[PDB]
Amino acid sequence: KGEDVPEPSVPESFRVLVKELQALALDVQTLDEKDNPVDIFEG
Amino acid sequence: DVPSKIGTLLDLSATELEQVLYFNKYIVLDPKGAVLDGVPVEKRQLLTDEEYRELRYGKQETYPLPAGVDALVKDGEEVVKGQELAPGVVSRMDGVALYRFPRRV
Amino acid sequence: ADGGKVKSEIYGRVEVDLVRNVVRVVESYDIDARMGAEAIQELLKELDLEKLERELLEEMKHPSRARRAKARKRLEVVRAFLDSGNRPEWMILEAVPVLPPDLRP
Amino acid sequence: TQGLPRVIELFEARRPKAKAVISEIDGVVRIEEGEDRLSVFVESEGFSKEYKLPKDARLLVKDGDYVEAGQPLTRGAIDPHQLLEAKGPEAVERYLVDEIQKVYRAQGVKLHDKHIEIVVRQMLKYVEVTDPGDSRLLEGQVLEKWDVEALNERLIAEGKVPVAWKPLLMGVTKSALSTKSWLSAASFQNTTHVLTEAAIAGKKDELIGLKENVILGRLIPAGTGSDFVRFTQVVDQRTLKAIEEARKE
């Protein structure tokens, strides 16, 4: 469509690992500089 | 793992004991270990399958007797580990005996 | 039996033999000794962590210096858990999670 | 030894074959006895330290010579761990770089020292505690993060213990191994140890290095992904004045 391409929301790699971690227990909190949580998922 | 991050926070003879506390028998005396097994309780420490029985159920032994033979010991008698209960039976534990079903009154 | 005269001198189960006219008590204490991860979990759930910090900061100063590189070792895990948010005992899972379907197709 | 095996020997801080003895102490040399048994004494006023040689050994201090703190007696290679304690961390750094280069040079290769330097410094990243202020008395700690305590408890919140440490020559691998961020640490020989541990402690990454962010699929913290440059915005003549006329509203 002749658009610039990206703004890739969140590296899938990231999501995958986090979930592949949950599956093994282990919370893996992702946090911004204000140190509160982010949710790299929205769903 | 290799430091055994559970069998360090409570010892449990490192491992071998931990691995013994699910697979392959062996109980861990959790709380209020109230007993004595020669010396007092072991608290957070190992115990057999027998040792548990011999500790909250008490020890009983039933000495099967051949038909037509007598019993050297009298019904209510503080019998001892090793003393003949019969001309064929040996008592494997120190304590009072009983008479489980007599054949002649 | 018989008011306050006849008393049991031991710990145990009470048997009542209304033929022998005796009350006997089988030498059986009431231990809470659980086997399995249920116990290991139970041991972990009730454990004063700070009290284990203390006993070690004391085993820090006056040891024979032999198994003193195991006394110190304990604290790394203890204090780790202490200023973590991790309650130990979570090392023992009640619910096991299931990895989402599309990640294991 | 020569070639690449040498460069590893070096980058990995490895106590070699033919350690070729160095004197631990200053003092005066004295070679004694031939063929039967060969030993060399470097005895100053006071101490008389003795250094028994293979006999075959091609020693390179002749009798009478005065000697230095960590000076080679025998020839051969030099242990970079023996050098650390005898003669400090810089002298170490300076040995490593100059030896590693001794080979690339010897062969044909020309590269700048800084590269080797950058790496070598990392071999010196950590130090082990002796008599602490906060943590357990034995732990290995990053040189900088100990200053985060040394020149912290001797300024604003001054007192307690400055935390004494020791210089700690880490081989290239070992050093790579002990690397704060668990994400990175995971990619090495035993991923479980890492995670097990890092899970117990509420461990956090922060994701400073690169090996980290590539793992996650994040935009590398370098080049165009450098915090120092990526926030740079470009506004365009008429866009700027028109953006100015909706700011005072």
XYZ file of C-alpha atoms in Angstrom, chain A:
43
model
C 0.000 0.000 0.000
C 3.059 2.222 -0.314
C 3.326 2.916 3.405
C 6.519 3.261 5.493
C 6.218 -0.202 7.134
C 6.975 -0.602 10.776
C 6.154 0.708 14.209
C 6.364 -2.996 15.322
C 4.222 -3.090 18.417
C 6.188 -5.559 20.575
C 8.795 -8.061 19.489
C 6.904 -11.362 19.344
C 10.124 -12.910 20.645
C 9.440 -11.064 23.900
C 5.804 -12.241 24.319
C 6.758 -15.790 23.444
C 9.546 -15.945 26.095
C 7.437 -14.358 28.832
C 4.645 -16.909 28.215
C 7.109 -19.727 27.706
C 8.296 -18.680 31.149
C 4.873 -18.512 32.861
C 4.411 -22.117 31.761
C 7.253 -23.037 34.077
C 5.968 -20.999 37.023
C 7.916 -17.694 37.365
C 6.107 -14.287 37.048
C 8.479 -12.296 34.756
C 7.210 -8.761 35.406
C 7.930 -6.251 32.616
C 8.356 -2.747 33.949
C 8.872 0.844 32.701
C 11.289 3.410 34.214
C 8.674 4.440 36.784
C 9.047 0.742 37.791
C 5.322 -0.090 37.487
C 4.055 -2.784 35.036
C 3.319 -2.577 31.319
C 1.511 -5.627 29.828
C 3.199 -6.244 26.499
C 0.018 -8.015 25.387
C -3.342 -6.163 25.748
C -5.339 -9.429 25.567
